[PDB]
Design a protein around this ligand. Structure first.
Ligand SMILES: C[n+]1cn([C@@H]2O[C@H](COP(=O)(O)OP(=O)(O)O)[C@@H](O)[C@H]2O)c2nc(N)[nH]c(=O)c21
Ligand SMILES: [Mg+2]
Ligand SMILES: [Mg+2]
Ligand code: NA
Length: 209
């Protein structure tokens, strides 16, 4: 409902999802697009760089010293793990998840002279290599408040439904090339992901209300 706030917990995140009426236009506003394809599939992106590896890189401060929490190893991509251990090359490493992917809703920063819908259109364009267009926007607006339990940071974002012109196959035959997204896929192919429950909830709330 317009009232209800729902809090999900994962091993990595706590997220509050609350229906609101208007998005507070300002400096740091993220707008996320929950995309439904023409043939009715919910979309999800795999972030190009994991949150874990981004954090790790930002924590370095020396030419001759590289520093990494082992707990983060299970939350990184193959190429990232390779980059970390490429020089040391020990026999093997532990705590790896070969099925890891960083699931994210598409979308981005609201710019100064920009409406919400224009922002959604533009960001969906940039993150899909010009392959996503919006036929119709939903009317339900959600506020997402995320605490990252690993890094102790809180993030705010706002989500809307985007019914796009493309089909699932339209976005799943050619690989993504831009710097933000490494893959666009059906959320329903991600049932075992840590984020699947709350993401599925976001889609269901946006379409079944
Ligand atoms: C760095 N980072 C970004 N996000 C999410 O991604 C959204 C974008 O946050 P951003 O870092 O400002 O943009 P970017 O992802 O393009 O760099 C945030 O509102 C958060 O929802 C993040 N979410 C978690 N759980 N942990 C993180 O480290 C993290
Ligand atoms: Mg960032
Ligand atoms: Mg973007
Ligand atoms: Na080796």
């Amino acid at each position: 409902t317009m009232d209800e706030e729902v809090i999900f917990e994962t091993p990595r995140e706590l997220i509050s999802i609350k229906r609101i009426k208007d998005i507070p236009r300002s400096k740091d506003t993220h707008v996320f697009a929950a995309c439904i394809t023409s043939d009715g599939y919910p979309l999800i992106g795999a972030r190009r760089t994991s949150f874990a590896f981004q954090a790790i890189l930002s924590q370095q401060n020396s030419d001759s010293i590289f520093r990494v929490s082992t707990k983060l190893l299970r939350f990184m991509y193959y190429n990232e793990l390779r980059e970390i251990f490429r020089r040391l090359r020990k026999g093997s490493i532990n705590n790896i998840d070969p099925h890891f992917e960083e699931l994210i809703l598409l979308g981005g920063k609201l710019d100064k002279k920009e409406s919400i819908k224009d922002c959604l259109r533009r960001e969906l364009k940039e993150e899909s290599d010009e392959r996503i267009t919006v036929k119709e926007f939903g009317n339900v607006i959600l506020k997402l408040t995320t605490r990252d339990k690993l890094f102790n940071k809180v993030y705010i974002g706002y989500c809307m439904a985007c019914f796009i012109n493309q089909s699932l196959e339209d976005l799943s035959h050619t690989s993504i090339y831009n710097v933000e997204i490494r893959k666009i896929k059906s959320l329903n192919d991600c049932i075992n992901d840590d984020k699947y429950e709350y993401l599925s909830y976001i889609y269901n709330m946006l379409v079944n209300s």
